[PDB]
């Protein structure tokens, strides 16, 4: 039901020039997303269950034919459950104790809510107590000159963990949660390893609520983009929306797609669900059901741990 992914070492999920809250000592040609986009966890699971029955497909039909509905993804220290929280180019990790009473902060007085925001992202934000952003420089060496091979100097910012951290995702059909338990895998990045460990931890799976939290990027069809980016206040209360590339398909070695989304950790209003459902009602809807199947459109109740997809 619930899957634990503990990184066995620092690991990197490449990101295109997206994170600039951190006062970097030196530069680096590639940052690392804090929480792996659901494309990465999807593909990581698909890698284990891959056969030659694949055939043709837009990397996702074939992918969706392998697994259940992945729900979302969030941090997990010893006992604690950390959750992503973003206010616009400003990310944070916080526990449930501070999600439960956000709406008031999001609607309270000017200076009271400024205080609340400040102490959220600075004081109670447990990010820097978990994640250290170590930079690695890499080079290659021509066996002839036995010196650096010219033009080959890459710099990557890895994600180093100060304490035992897992990634918590929920799936179904334990018919696969058997062939997946206790398996180390090249969890997304340049040849990094993480361990899978599935347990049994039942959670709620449906709830209606005023405010929700986006544990995974909510994808925008771009037919709504025009008629959505004008009234954000109706849908999102706090977070960040921007173009993201889905990933990189291994089938035919190409960048996957691109579409505006709401990044992992973002306070959306219940006016989201009706919007998305009552905006796309055709082949678009089937495409986005394929999307959400691999953990894309996910909310989480700010009060108790309960998830829900959008189009289902």
């Amino acid at each position: 039901k619930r899957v634990l992914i503990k990184p066995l070492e620092p690991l990197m999920f490449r990101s295109q020039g997206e994170f600039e809250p951190l006062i970097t000592g030196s530069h680096t040609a590639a940052q690392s997303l804090i929480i792996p986009r659901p494309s990465t966890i999807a593909g990581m699971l698909g890698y284990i269950l891959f056969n030659k029955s694949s055939g043709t497909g837009d990397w996702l039909s074939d992918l969706t034919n392998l697994l259940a509905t992945i729900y979302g993804t969030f941090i997990e220290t010893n006992g604690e459950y950390l959750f992503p929280l973003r206010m616009g180019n400003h990310l944070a990790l916080v526990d449930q104790q501070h999600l439960i009473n956000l709406p008031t902060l999001l609607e309270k007085e000017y200076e009271r809510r400024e205080k609340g925001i400040y102490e959220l992202f600075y004081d109670k934000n447990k990010l820097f107590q978990i994640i250290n952003h170590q930079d690695r420089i890499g080079i290659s060496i021509d066996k002839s000159t036995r010196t650096v091979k010219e033009h080959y100097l890459y710099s990557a910012r890895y994600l180093a963990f100060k304490k035992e951290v897992n990634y918590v995702i929920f799936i179904d059909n334990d018919a696969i949660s058997d062939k997946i338990n206790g398996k180390i895998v090249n969890f997304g990045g340049e040849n990094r390893i993480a361990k899978l460990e599935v347990d049994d931890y039942k959670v709620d799976t449906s709830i209606e609520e005023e405010y929700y939290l986006a544990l995974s990027p909510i994808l925008i069809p771009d037919e709504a983009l025009d008629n959505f980016l004008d009234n954000i206040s109706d849908y999102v209360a706090m977070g960040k929306v921007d173009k993201i590339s889905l990933g990189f398909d291994i089938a035919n070695t190409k960048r996957k797609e691109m579409l505006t989304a709401i990044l992992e950790g973002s306070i959306v209003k219940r006016s989201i669900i009706d919007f998305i459902k009552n905006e796309i009602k055709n082949d678009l809807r089937y495409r986005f059901s394929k999307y959400e199947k691999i953990g894309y459109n996910t909310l989480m109740s700010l009060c108790k741990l309960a998830l829900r997809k959008i189009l289902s």
Binding site: Q97, I100, P103, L105
Partner: protein
């Protein structure tokens, strides 16, 4: 049936005489097992009256009161002003859930008057001066959690969660 009793945890010595049933049955939902306190319930929209601190009703949700859940019925000297109700395992928000609940529970809450004679201008409480922590681990976690100084030698941990996990808004009035 089934009954628990939430005991508020302020910085005040309002913990000595509010309990009579120290164990009663067999089961506590909160457990300090080699990782600190767990399964901690937080209540939003309430308050304190630290002069004989009992839970005061408010309407701000940012006000929180964190404490421990134990089993029983308090003192047989209540049920006239104490908030009594039954909530079956899901209308509670626990911190560090370790076990599960069997969907049946009546809750007893130390409740006081709405106090409509002075504004409840409220401010949190930071758990400092570990002397009070030294006394509060004994006052409740030794008169209910008698297993203290029987299995837990790592008292250095059972106090840090009291420095970091527990707080509440105080009315100071």
């Amino acid at each position: 049936s089934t009954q628990r009793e939430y005991v508020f945890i302020p910085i005040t010595n309002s913990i000595t005489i509010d309990v009579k049933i120290t164990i009663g049955g067999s089961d506590h939902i909160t457990n300090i097992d080699e990782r600190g306190i767990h399964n901690v319930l937080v209540i939003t929209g309430y308050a304190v009256d630290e002069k004989n601190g009992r839970l005061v009703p408010t309407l701000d949700p940012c006000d929180y009161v964190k404490g421990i859940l134990v089993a029983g019925t308090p003192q047989q000297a209540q049920s006239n002003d104490f908030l009594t109700l039954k909530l079956p395992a899901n209308k509670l928000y626990l911190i560090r859930k370790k076990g599960n609940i069997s969907d049946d529970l009546k809750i007893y809450i130390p409740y006081s008057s709405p106090d409509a004679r002075n504004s409840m201008k409220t401010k949190p409480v930071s758990i400092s001066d570990d002397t009070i922590v030294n006394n509060i681990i004994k006052e409740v976690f030794d008169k209910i959690y008698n297993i203290t100084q029987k299995e837990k030698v790592k008292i250095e941990k059972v106090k840090e969660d009291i420095k970091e996990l527990f707080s509440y808004y105080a009315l100071e009035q």
